[PDB]
Amino acid sequence: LFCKGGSCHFGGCPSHLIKVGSCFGFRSCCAWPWNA
């Protein structure tokens, strides 16, 4: 599941990414830090 900036991951976000918001349900939406 993509996320405005990156991708969604259940649990949280890869150290690289930034939590943009919630993903489908219990999942977390992650985007890239460039501006997050």
Side-chain angles (χ1 to χ4, degrees), residues 11-33:
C13 292
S15 43
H16 339 114
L17 300 193
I18 35 81
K19 181 65 165 289
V20 257
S22 21
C23 173
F24 195 46
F26 44 11
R27 285 180 287 187
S28 284
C29 244
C30 316
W32 270 94

